A paper describes a structure:
Recently, we characterized [name] among the various Cyps of the parasite, demonstrating its high [name] activity and its ability to bind cyclosporin A (CsA), a well‐known inhibitor of Cyps (Favretto et al., 2023). [name] shows remarkable sequence identity with human CypA (~52% of identity) but has a 40‐aminoacid N‐terminal extension. Here, three new structures of the protein in complex with the three non‐immunosuppressive derivatives NIM811, dhCsA, and Alisporivir have been solved at 1.17, 1.20, and 1.20 Å resolution, respectively.
[name] (dhCsA), a closely related co‐metabolite of CsA, presents a saturation of the double bond of the unusual amino acid (4R)‐4‐([E]‐2‐butenyl)‐4‐methyl‐N‐methyl‐(L)‐threonine (MeBmt‐1) in position 1, has minimal reported immunosuppressive activity, and serves as a control in determining the role of immunosuppression in CsA‐based treatment of parasitic infections (Chappell et al., 1987; Meier et al., 1990). NIM811, dhCsA, and Alisporivir are attached to the CsA binding pocket. The backbone for these three derivatives is nearly identical to that of CsA. Remarkably, all the modifications in the non‐immunosuppressive derivatives are exposed, protrude from the binding site, and are not involved in the crystal packing. In all cases, the asymmetric unit is composed of two monomers with almost identical structure (RMSD values between 0.112 and 0.141 Å for the Cα superpositions). Remarkably, both NIM811 and dhCsA closely resembled the [name]:CsA complex, implying that chemical modifications at position 4 of CsA exert negligible influence on the binding to the protein. Specifically, Alisporivir displayed the highest interaction affinity with [name] (Kd = 15 ± 3 nM) while dhCsA showed the lowest affinity (Kd = 200 ± 92 nM).
Residue numbers in the entry:
A (entry chain D): 1 to 11
B (entry chain B): 13 to 211
The structure:
């Protein structure tokens, strides 16, 4: 996908 | 309390932000900070950023202290000087500010290990907005992203808390956005905040 995480980048 | 793109306050359209200098446009007491950026060993220019203290005071003050060196751990300042952009996705956003680990796992705020989400007032409605990276609800720390396109799917999950000011700022954002990256979207050549502060 197009997220902005800090640790586990998801699709 | 998310505003639609026709309820937006004055001073935050793309055109308005591109006319900005070093003073805030949304509210007169909003701080303006800056990053000087190096791409590899080459100076790329300055990004000036209005922090929306009037809408997201805790988020603005966290970012502001990390720019000025005012936040200390046992008398040792820590913040964005020397921090990198570790995740760069063309046509989406540029992500950085992990001064803890440099890889996207780091989380530290001026309030403790993390701080809660403030109200989600502004949408991710255009390029050039500053928003908090996190790992789910109430996990804000030090990382941030600058939008390189609208990304409203992020609304109500990330607090939009600032905007870049002036055309040079967006030119630098676009330069960072277009550097070569690996399969994990890490730049092949480092992108670093070499200096930062308040204007």
């Amino acid at each position: 996908x197009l997220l902005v995480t800090a640790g586990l980048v998801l699709a | 309390s998310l505003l639609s793109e026709s309820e937006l306050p004055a001073g935050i359209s793309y055109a308005e932000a591109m006319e900005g200098g070093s003073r805030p446009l949304l509210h007169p007491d909003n701080p303006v900070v800056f990053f000087d950026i190096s791409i590899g060993s080459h100076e790329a220019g300055r990004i000036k950023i209005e922090l929306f203290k009037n809408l997201a005071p805790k988020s603005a003050e966290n970012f502001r202290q990390f720019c000025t060196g005012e936040f200390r751990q046992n008398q040792v300042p820590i913040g964005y000087k020397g921090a990198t952009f570790h995740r760069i996705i063309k046509n989406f956003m540029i992500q950085g500010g992990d001064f803890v680990k440099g890889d996207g796992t780091g989380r530290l705020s001026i309030y403790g290990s993390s701080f809660p989400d403030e109200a989600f007032v502004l949408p991710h409605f255009r390029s050039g907005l500053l928003s908090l990276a996190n790992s789910g609800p109430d996990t804000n720390g030090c990382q941030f992203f600058i939008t390189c396109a609208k990304c409203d799917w992020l609304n109500r999950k990330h607090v939009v808390f600032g905007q870049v000011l002036g055309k040079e700022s967006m030119q630098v954002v676009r330069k960072i956005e277009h550097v070569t990256v690996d399969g994990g979207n890490r730049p092949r050549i480092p992108v670093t905040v070499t200096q930062c502060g308040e204007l």
